Amino acid sequence: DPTQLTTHAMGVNIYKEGQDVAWLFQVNLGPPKKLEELEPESREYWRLLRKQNIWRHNRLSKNK
Amino acid sequence: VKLVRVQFCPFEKNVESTRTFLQTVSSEKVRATNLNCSVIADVREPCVDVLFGDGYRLIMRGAHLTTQEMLSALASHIRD
Amino acid sequence: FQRQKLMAITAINPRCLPPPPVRLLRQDIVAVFRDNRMIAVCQNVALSAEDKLLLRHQLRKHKIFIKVFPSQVLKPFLENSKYRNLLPLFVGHNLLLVSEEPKVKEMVRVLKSVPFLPLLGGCVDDTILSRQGLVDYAK
Amino acid sequence: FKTKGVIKKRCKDCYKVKRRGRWFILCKTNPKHKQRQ
Amino acid sequence: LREVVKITVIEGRITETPKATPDPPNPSGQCPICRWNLKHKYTYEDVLLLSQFIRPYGGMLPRRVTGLCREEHRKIEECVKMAHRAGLLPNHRPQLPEGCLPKDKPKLNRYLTRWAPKSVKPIYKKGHRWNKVGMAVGSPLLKDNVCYSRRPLKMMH
Amino acid sequence: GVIRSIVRAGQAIPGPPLGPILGQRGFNEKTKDIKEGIPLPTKIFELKIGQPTVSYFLKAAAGISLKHVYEIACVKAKDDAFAMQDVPLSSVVRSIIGSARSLG
RNA sequence: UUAACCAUUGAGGCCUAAAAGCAGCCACCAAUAAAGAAAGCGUUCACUCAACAUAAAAAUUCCAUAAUUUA
Numbered sequence: 001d002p003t004q005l006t007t008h009a010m011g012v013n014i015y016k017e018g019q020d021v022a023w024l025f026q027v028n029l030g031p032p033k034k035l036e037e038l039e040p041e042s043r044e045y046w047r048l049l050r051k052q053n054i055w056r057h058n059r060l061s062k063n064k
Numbered sequence: 065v066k067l068v069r070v071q072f073c074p075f076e077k078n079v080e081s082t083r084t085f086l087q088t089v090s091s092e093k094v095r096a097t098n099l100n101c102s103v104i105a106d107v108r109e110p111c112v113d114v115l116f117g118d119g120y121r122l123i124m125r126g127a128h129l130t131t132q133e134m135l136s137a138l139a140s141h142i143r144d
Numbered sequence: 145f146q147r148q149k150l151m152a153i154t155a156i157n158p159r160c161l162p163p164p165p166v167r168l169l170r171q172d173i174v175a176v177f178r179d180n181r182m183i184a185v186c187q188n189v190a191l192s193a194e195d196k197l198l199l200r201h202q203l204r205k206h207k208i209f210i211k212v213f214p215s216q217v218l219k220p221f222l223e224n225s226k227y228r229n230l231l232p233l234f235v236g237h238n239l240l241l242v243s244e245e246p247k248v249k250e251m252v253r254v255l256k257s258v259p260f261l262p263l264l265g266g267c268v269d270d271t272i273l274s275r276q277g278l279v280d281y282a283k
Numbered sequence: 284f285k286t287k288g289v290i291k292k293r294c295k296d297c298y299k300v301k302r303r304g305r306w307f308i309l310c311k312t313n314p315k316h317k318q319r320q
Numbered sequence: 321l322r323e324v325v326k327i328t329v330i331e332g333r334i335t336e337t338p339k340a341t342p343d344p345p346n347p348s349g350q351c352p353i354c355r356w357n358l359k360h361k362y363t364y365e366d367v368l369l370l371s372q373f374i375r376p377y378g379g380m381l382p383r384r385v386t387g388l389c390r391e392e393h394r395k396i397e398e399c400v401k402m403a404h405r406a407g408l409l410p411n412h413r414p415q416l417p418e419g420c421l422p423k424d425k426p427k428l429n430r431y432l433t434r435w436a437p438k439s440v441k442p443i444y445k446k447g448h449r450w451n452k453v454g455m456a457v458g459s460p461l462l463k464d465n466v467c468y469s470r471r472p473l474k475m476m477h
Numbered sequence: 478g479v480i481r482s483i484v485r486a487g488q489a490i491p492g493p494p495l496g497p498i499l500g501q502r503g504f505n506e507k508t509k510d511i512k513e514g515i516p517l518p519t520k521i522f523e524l525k526i527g528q529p530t531v532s533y534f535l536k537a538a539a540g541i542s543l544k545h546v547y548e549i550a551c552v553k554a555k556d557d558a559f560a561m562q563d564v565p566l567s568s569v570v571r572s573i574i575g576s577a578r579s580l581g
Numbered sequence: 582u583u584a585a586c587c588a589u590u591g592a593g594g595c596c597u598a599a600a601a602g603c604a605g606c607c608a609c610c611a612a613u614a615a616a617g618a619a620a621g622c623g624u625u626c627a628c629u630c631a632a633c634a635u636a637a638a639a640a641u642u643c644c645a646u647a648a649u650u651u652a
């Protein structure tokens with residue numbers, strides 16, 4: 001039941017000694033950040049910019 | 065190689081070559097490869113002493129010895 | 145043949161000549177020094193990536209971090225800072241055992257978890273000292 | 284030792300040599316890759 | 321100079337090395353050769369100059385240690401080969417591994433030898449006057465050297 | 478030699494996963510402590526108790542919310558071998574979010 | 582003009598018990614200084630390149646002889 005998931009915390013208790021009894025909520029919920037989403041001056045933007053550079057090489061690498 | 069002893073003095077002047085040589089000895093994979101040797105690290109010019117089962121004891125000081133010479137010396141000695 | 149004849153008819157090397165004549169990382173080195181009271185310099189033992197993580201993660205459970213920076217960019221601040229005797233230490237691959245409490249004895253104990261890894265020295269409670277001194281203070 | 288106009292490496296381990304006035308690529312892993320100009 | 325002495329205990333000991341002559345004629349010379357104004361004035365027969373860059377057994381020294389620029393690292397290397405083949409470096413012979421004796425064949429006097437004698441095939445068909453095939457003498461790398469003749473040196477004889 | 482072979486707690490037999498590595502080269506703890514019927518990573522070398530895989534947990538939630546996504550993240554940092562010791566929660570929540578999006 | 586260097590989980594789910602960077606198919610992400618649900622590989626699931634870090638880069642028989650520097 002989707003409602004049961006919200007009402008009762010399945011994650012907190014997963015031991016046989018229980019039955020899923022019931023900044024944390026401020027984290028990003030959005031989709032994967034693309035180069036446009038990332039802030040140009042943020043480390044993530046430059047970090048994921050390298051990933052895009054890695055993307056092109058990997059696609060060429062896959063073809064061989 | 066029955067035992068390998070490496071001693072170097074951080075407080076006193078210490079040559080880089082022996083330290084770079086020591087960390088190679090201080091490696092899990094290297095330790096497994098040379099299973100026979102009992103690796104002991106001494107910290108207090110630097111002197112490296114390695115003992116062999118046949119009784120040959122080789123003392124290597126890093127004062128003016130480059131890392132290649134130590135590694136080459138060990139490799140040749142291991143071959144016997 | 146004259147046609148070919150016409151066609152043929154129609155000072156200092158730049159080598160010897162004299163040749164004409166990190167900031168983000170700088171903050172990171174400053175940040176670790178400001179955040180962590182004690183910085184212990186230990187040689188990077190080239191441990192396996194999986195084994196390297198668990199040591200950092202295990203220390204993370206103890207709220208102890210591991211910090212590493214290139215030596216050449218680390219020279220300037222170490223030259224002018226409370227920690228000045230670590231410059232010869234910071235040669236080659238290296239790691240920093242940085243925490244918020246003076247767990248010098250436990251730092252060696254965690255270092256003793258892998259016997260091959262030695263300790264070169266560092267500072268505890270903002271006091272720069274060598275390993276021989278650190279052991280005495282650890283007692 | 285096929286004699287070809289152009290010598291081209293066939294593997295990473297392949298290396299180049301200049302023996303007796305000609306160019307040779309010899310591969311330790313695979314003797315097939317051995318060639319001559 | 322650090323050299324290894326063996327006894328087993330083997331120790332490498334640093335010894336004093338000869339110092340370079342001060343006051344080069346050309347100050348601030350980027351490349352050691354140019355420093356001494358010998359950029360385009362040395363040839364194969366200049367044993368004294370070449371000897372300063374050669375290992376005791378006749379091998380070439382690394383560029384870094386010597387400090388020569390690549391342009392003069394290849395020319396110097398080329399001249400050294402010519403000197404060895406001409407028997408101008410009798411005291412830098414190869415190290416005999418196990419007391420092996422030389423080939424014992426008499427040595428033919430040669431100079432200005434571009435290629436190794438073993439790797440050169442004979443030219444059986446000489447060719448006619450117009451098409452005549454040429455025999456290499458000297459090396460092209462020394463094109464820029466000063467010439468004291470009316471016309472440029474003939475590389476191919 | 479580290480072997481990453483595991484079966485569901487409810488299942489009491491090694492099954493195909495375990496055997497091949499031993500041939501190539503040459504669990505009760507889970508059944509009791511943690512809820513049964515859910516897969517969990519292990520690092521047999523030395524079987525170690527491990528927390529259930531989130532992805533199947535996400536599928537279990539999907540039968541194939543934000544509070545549920547967060548709830549699992551808070552208690553997730555309960556293992557050492559797993560390497561799931563990232564104190565900053567952003568790592569865990571973003572990781573499960575990236576897994577939730579990819580899974581159907 | 583070519584180099585040895587390092588290589589991080591929530592097992593992403595999916596028809597293939599179940600698919601970890603991955604047989605496979607759809608998504609293809611999360612943290613990280615810095616990593617492609619990866620380049621190959623590994624793997625019925627579960628060695629390493631790219632990143633980071635990186636010392637460098639055609640038929641009888643060849644056919645003048647010879648010669649590198651004197652203005």
Ligand code: FES
Pocket residue numbers: 159160161349350351352353354355358359388389391392
């Ligand atoms: S001789 Fe001057 S640039 Fe080398």
Ligand SMILES: [Zn+2]
Pocket residue numbers: 293294295296297309310311312313316
């Ligand atoms: Zn090959």
